[PDB]
Amino acid sequence: NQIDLNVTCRYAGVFHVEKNGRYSISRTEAADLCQAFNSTLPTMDQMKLALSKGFETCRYGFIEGNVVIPRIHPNAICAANHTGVYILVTSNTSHYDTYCFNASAPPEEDCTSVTDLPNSFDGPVTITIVNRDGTRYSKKGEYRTHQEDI
Numbered sequence: 001n002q003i004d005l006n007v008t009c010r011y012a013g014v015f016h017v018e019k020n021g022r023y024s025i026s027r028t029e030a031a032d033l034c035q036a037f038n039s040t041l042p043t044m045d046q047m048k049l050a051l052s053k054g055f056e057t058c059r060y061g062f063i064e065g066n067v068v069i070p071r072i073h074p075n076a077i078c079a080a081n082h083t084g085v086y087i088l089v090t091s092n093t094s095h096y097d098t099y100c101f102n103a104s105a106p107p108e109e110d111c112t113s114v115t116d117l118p119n120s121f122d123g124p125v126t127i128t129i130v131n132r133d134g135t136r137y138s139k140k141g142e143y144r145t146h147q148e149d150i
């Protein structure tokens, strides 16, 4: 009973989280996941500022009201070669990664490891934060509040 959460550097407080390295987070689970990081889904303006500080990914993820990919460099296989905050327009499906926003993070690029999930609640799941450098932090808990997500 295990969940890996792969996390990025923060840029103006915004970061990306993949669950088990596959698109697998619903919109309700995304909100709950950010809440466990004492974070919220980013607004578009928060994401645009993060972009301006150096944030880009090659993965779709939830922000408050849309599913997006922040892009700095044009890449054919990431967001159809777009730059800027690319907004997903047409999709059949409902499960993506998520972005999260932590107001207490540093203002620009913070590529230090994440070593806590401060607002997880009591539960039976081994939750492991996995940083890009491989650094790992594990705890027993839960973050999902909707039955449909579990």
Ligand SMILES: Nc1cccc2c1CN(CCCN1CCOCC1)CC2
Pocket: 006, 007, 008, 018, 021, 058, 059, 130, 131, 132, 133
């Ligand atoms: N941030 C982080 C922390 C721990 C593990 C991983 C990550 C980020 N993941 C990025 C996947 C991006 N793919 C998109 C295009 O296909 C190859 C890489 C790859 C796995």
